[PDB]
Amino acid sequence: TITYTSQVANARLGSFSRLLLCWRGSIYKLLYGEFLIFLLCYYIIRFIYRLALTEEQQLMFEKLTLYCDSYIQLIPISFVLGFYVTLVVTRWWNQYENLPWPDRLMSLVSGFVEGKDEQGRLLRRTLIRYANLGNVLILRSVSTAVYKRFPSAQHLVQAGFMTPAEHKQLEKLSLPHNMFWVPWVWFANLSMKAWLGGRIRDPILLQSLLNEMNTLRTQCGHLYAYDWISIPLVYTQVVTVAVYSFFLTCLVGRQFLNPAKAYPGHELDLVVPVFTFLQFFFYVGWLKVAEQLINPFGEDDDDFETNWIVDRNLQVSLLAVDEMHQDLPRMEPDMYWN
Amino acid sequence: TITYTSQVANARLGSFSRLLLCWRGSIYKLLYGEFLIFLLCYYIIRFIYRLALTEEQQLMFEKLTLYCDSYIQLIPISFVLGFYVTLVVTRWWNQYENLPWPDRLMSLVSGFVEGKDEQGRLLRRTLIRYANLGNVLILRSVSTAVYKRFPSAQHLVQAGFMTPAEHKQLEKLSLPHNMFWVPWVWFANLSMKAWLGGRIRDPILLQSLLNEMNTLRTQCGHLYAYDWISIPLVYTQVVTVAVYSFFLTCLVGRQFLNPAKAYPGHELDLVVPVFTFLQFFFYVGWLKVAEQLINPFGEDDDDFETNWIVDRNLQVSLLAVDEMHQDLPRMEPDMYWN
Amino acid sequence: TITYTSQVANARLGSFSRLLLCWRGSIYKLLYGEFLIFLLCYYIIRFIYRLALTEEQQLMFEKLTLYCDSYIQLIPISFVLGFYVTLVVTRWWNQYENLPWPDRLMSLVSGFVEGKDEQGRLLRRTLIRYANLGNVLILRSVSTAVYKRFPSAQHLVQAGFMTPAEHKQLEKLSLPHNMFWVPWVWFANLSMKAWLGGRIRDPILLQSLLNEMNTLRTQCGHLYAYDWISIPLVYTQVVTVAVYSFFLTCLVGRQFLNPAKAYPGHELDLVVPVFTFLQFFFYVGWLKVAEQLINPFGEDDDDFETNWIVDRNLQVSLLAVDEMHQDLPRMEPDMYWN
Amino acid sequence: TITYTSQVANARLGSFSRLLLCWRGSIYKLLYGEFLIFLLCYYIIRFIYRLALTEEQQLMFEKLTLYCDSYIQLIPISFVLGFYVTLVVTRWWNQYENLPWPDRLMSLVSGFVEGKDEQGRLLRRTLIRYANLGNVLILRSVSTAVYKRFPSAQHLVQAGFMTPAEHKQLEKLSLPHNMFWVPWVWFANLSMKAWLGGRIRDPILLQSLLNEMNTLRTQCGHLYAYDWISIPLVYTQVVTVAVYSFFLTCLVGRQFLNPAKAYPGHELDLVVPVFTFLQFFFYVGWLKVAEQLINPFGEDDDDFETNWIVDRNLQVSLLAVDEMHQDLPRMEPDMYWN
Amino acid sequence: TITYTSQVANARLGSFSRLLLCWRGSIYKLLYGEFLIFLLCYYIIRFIYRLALTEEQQLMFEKLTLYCDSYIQLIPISFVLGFYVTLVVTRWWNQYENLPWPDRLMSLVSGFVEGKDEQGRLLRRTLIRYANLGNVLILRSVSTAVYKRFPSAQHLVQAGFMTPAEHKQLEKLSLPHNMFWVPWVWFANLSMKAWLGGRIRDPILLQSLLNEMNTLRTQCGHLYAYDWISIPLVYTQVVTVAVYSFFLTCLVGRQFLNPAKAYPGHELDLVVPVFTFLQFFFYVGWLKVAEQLINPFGEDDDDFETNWIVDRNLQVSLLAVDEMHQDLPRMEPDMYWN
Ligand SMILES: [Ca+2]
Ligand SMILES: [Ca+2]
Ligand SMILES: [Ca+2]
Ligand SMILES: [Ca+2]
Ligand SMILES: [Ca+2]
């Protein structure tokens, strides 16, 4: 993701005008290639019309240009594209809200699971590891970035998410469907064992651990759902057709006809169709933003930093439950004490 | 459902343009039959006008064409169709969010319900079976796909969702209304029996089981609600009338009048009304998407894979609570251990 | 309600086109009377203009017709009516989501409240009855259908919702405001008595019962809120004025002027203003849908089946907690067992 | 609030047309004064133009009228006003959903807090009083109606919400900020004392009491938030400017020019600009509805009955926990018993 | 923030018209500098056109003015700006809802954590301090105002949020990422220690403390998310380009051409383009409101009073748990007692 929230903390002169000079995560980066293809086609058509067609061919071309410019408005481009973009943006933020953070769980696993010995350490680390393993198994499914980082389960084994025992146990349980759900069943059985073994003192704390873990399940499930149930392919096809039809008809309708013939609206020849390029910038940029956001777990500049999230989550989880377990700052009176 | 989320992970040149070449779940599949009927009617009208009407009849037809094309905009097609489609898409995603997944419950039933003997196995399998049975009873009500798979309760008996004892007990409890609610009462009474019999060690875990099961009830109830309370038939009728009236008036208003008479906007005869066909594609495609999504539990390409969900849920539930109960990977220090 | 969800399970040719031939719950049923009044007024005005006015009177009428048709667009009918309808539809579905279903509670009352003797039966039936009584007291307030079924509390007594003791106890507690809240206080005091008397074994189950009951309270409260706080009367008045002003000005603006005088847009006389009737169908139908949905607890075809819900809820609640208490199907291994 | 939900239970002929004849809470009441000022200004301008200006002055005035009527559409009145009104209506209903009702809490305080003696009565009444006191302290902050009823804390003391001891304890704790939060800390410390003193038998019930009370806190906090964080003053200023600029330009643009000069659109002089008055009714009425709803805790006809809510809440709370504690109807078999 | 909720409690004549005379938090303050730059450029262009260009240059300029004014509508300024502003306003209110208030937690810490001695005081103050420290660590990240108040952790130490021991313990745990999460792990380990040490009597109260604290975590996480995941930079760039392109083309298209040449729409020269300035006020004001709200934790007039919130929260938390612990008003019968 490209963050600029600090830069726009206060309304000031120009404001978003300083943001126009940004390349990474910008509309220019998303639009230049399609724009250059449109620019080439437009000028090829202009050159064909001006230096290839005969007089009667030029008259026919001019009729077709006035016809196309007249029936540009039949295309409900605003209608279709507005609907599509609102759908994509809603889904994008819903996808971000369902990224699982183990912080609520790691605080409970650090507090409730007793023992400063080797076995307590191992139990706490393995519980949070199950939480982080569940998240990374769902993320490698839903994220092309994470999958490229972890092409197989053995890659998770060499990265600390999975032990060899865990790996072979998952291979034994292999089912045709996705097996991201397994660490939750592992977490429940391990936490029950811990409670029965006296490492968890009361089953109310055990209830509290399982609720936090199940919250993460529900978030992972939402991620699974957004990956599986795409925006209906009909809508993507329709909005794609709307944008392409609009600019394909602009390739002819927005030519500068011979100003000698004094057609209404064609009196002045400016060579560069500035307003047509502005409409391309707005409409195609708008579509290209939707193309970027439709799967926010790709490798786009403004896609979520899913690998960063995975690494941070595992580091913070292991710190919080191993080194921070019953390690507290000395409790001393504050500055406002008396 | 047709999933393409991986294909659109990154914004790239064309992007959704590769999706235009997809047939399954496509706008072409939804539109071709209605489009071919519209195409036939339009050209029949053109041929009648050009080779059947006399001169004065042609003048009257031309007057009617200019009148119809002038009063095409009285039809609030964008207004009505936008409202309808937003309603349908909201309901569609709400319907997906209320598909019950037993994962939260199966982890609790695997952890809390004690015993590696025959009776423990049987108790855990029957509890998750009650959850899966409740889901399949509601789904066969709300889903034509599931109902075709399970025309009667005996079909559920031969598929492992229902035992003969369960089947005869449901026949004894028969009420005029839908009896999807029964497995929840079975689950509560069995879980209470389990707790009293010592298979559940503490009533806090019993509370936790009943909360998860009741969550699934609330999801099933939402599914029942969306199946029963249709989008008001007035709205479907109105949007249907709007789209059909628009294209029925286009059948005459969008004819290419005699270019000899030099009517304004009718100077050029292109035979093929490209913009009228594009408007058909946008508006009728938009309606046909709503027709597909209005009941997402049908047998449409882009409808939910409800049978797949049912089979997966039962397989994963039974695995998680029977074979995964107190079967844990050997707890060994991770790669980051020290 | 009129349900057609099964009929529209798959996108097919015509699709909603088979729904056009439905009378119950249809736009035709909602529109015919107002439409027939509009049809009579329009033709009366046409006949007055054509067979009553003198030549100079006809010229003045024609001026007024062209003026009215020109300033039809000043009326923000789409603006106002779109806002109103989105408000009504949101509130309509929110009202449905807050219909209380005792299923979550009846499963807990069947499981937790112990005793197969007379006193256990009586206690379980009275607890669910308090839940159903609270719902029917709020529903008879918010629903004209339920109130017509139960004009007084004695009608609830003869229908099994209320005992004579309960009736006289409510008469003793009479307050100026609505007393739907009383069964919740009864439920809490009875459930506490049950727990102290040993019919509920652990206060965690007692907590679980009170949470479910309080959920139903919060739903009933929402119903109370939607009944009391109407859509602001200003909005209903404004949208009513917008629709009526639009069609009152159409009564004159949409007349077919003398085609002899060759007014622009009045060249062709079709007698029947098809597009004006289509606009009536869209706009007035749209308003009439809002009039139907604004109170979904009336006796409209597409209003909620509140009496059906009340009867079903009481039947299912009493079955679930009396006949289904500790009556379980014989637990036998499933088909997938081994 | 003005409630008419019963009146609109069924769609019928006219429907909202009977609501047009309502004065209290009506658009007429909100619009008449501004409308009468607009009506006076319009006719003053007409009289100045017709009986004060010379011929060349009349020509200049007519030029300015045609200019103004031409550039009326530059004002994005629909854009701005639609955005503003959707914001206001969302906030209005969110404000209503966060009015705290003690019903969930009063049922728990009636059930859990034991003792039919003086001390039990006093403890239960004081707990619900803390809940009602917290609500009335936040409401007198956010509601001008409640503040006028209770100008000082001593007014709360004479109305039964606050005891003299409670009053002096709040005066001792005085902080620069609002002290609505204090009764929640009182409720928690009193409920803990009650539990330690054996009036609450189990800490699970104590947990249940504190959760309900904290829910009311979160609702009161939302009310505090909506009172403090106004709709941004920029939006109110902009929508105010949009509506006023539109009608100030209508004062000249919508004059009926001399019909002798036969200006396009000015052929017919009707003296009364019916469509301009209709646009005033729609747009200014729409703004005035937003002005009414922007603070729903004022003394407007359609503002919430906050004083009624406060009185009802205290009466019902005290009844439910004092007179209804362990007072149950005799449990007798229902009509459906056997 | 600028609050005026009390001022608009009732709909009255003018209403928001008294708000037009407000400078702090006003549209005038947000618009004047950009407006003055636009005003200078417009009049410079007018003076160049009127007193610098030759006759043929004036004809060319007039052609370009009529071209620009004709193709002003190609810019989807309403489309783009409406989408952007709805996104910003949603995010703004979501950001406010996720400001953490310790009131729910401080009531539980005051009630549950026992002891009127030094150690009880110290334990209660340190628990709420951990809650307030977590909030201030996230706020100094997401808020430029708080960061300017607390440039380093030592500034938090001198302000009472952090003890020197806490400061050195955080320095020892330093990770590359943000360490706002640490006080939650501290809170969980301290609350567990308190429970084991008998200061918390039952683990149900311990569960209740950890749930409240974890709620605050989830709110802080949302704040972190809104700070990190900006509105996509593509949208800000596009809306910026739309507004600037619209007014840059207005600089030429909205000039008053020579009225001698009697161009259509240019008959009257008013020197001041009132409607162009009104459109600037609406559109640029609308953008500038979005610029103000996009980061509501800056130092803008209408930005959240985050420093005030932080100070209030710490003062109220410390009061509630130290001075208000087991300090209750004398429980005496209320005015309605009997
Ligand atoms: Ca992407
Ligand atoms: Ca379907
Ligand atoms: Ca109704
Ligand atoms: Ca108000
Ligand atoms: Ca700001």
Author numbering:
A (entry chain C), B (entry chain D), C (entry chain E), D (entry chain A), E (entry chain B): 2 to 339
Quoted passage from the original study:
Bestrophin-1 (Best1) and bestrophin-2 (Best2) are two members of the bestrophin family of calcium (Ca2+)-activated chloride (Cl−) channels with critical involvement in ocular physiology and direct pathological relevance. Ample electrophysiological evidence indicates that the neck and aperture serve as dual Ca2+-dependent channel “gates”, as disrupting either of them partially impairs Ca2+-dependence while disrupting both makes the channel completely Ca2+-independent.
To further investigate the structural significance of the AS, we generated hBest11–345 and bBest21–345, and solved their structures in the presence of 5 mM Ca2+ at 2.4 Å and 1.9 Å, respectively. Remarkably, hBest11–345 and hBest21–345 were indistinguishable, both displaying robust leak currents with similar amplitudes in the absence of Ca2+ and significantly increased currents with similar amplitudes at 1 μM Ca2+ compared to the respective FL channels (using two-tailed unpaired Student t test), which is consistent with the 100% fully open neck in their structures. Remarkably, removing the AS from hBest1 and hBest2 results in truncation mutants that both exhibit a fully open neck in 100% of Ca2+-bound particles in cryo-EM and conduct indistinguishable and significantly elevated currents in patch clamp, while swapping the AS between hBest1 and hBest2 results in chimeric mutants with exchanged channel activities.
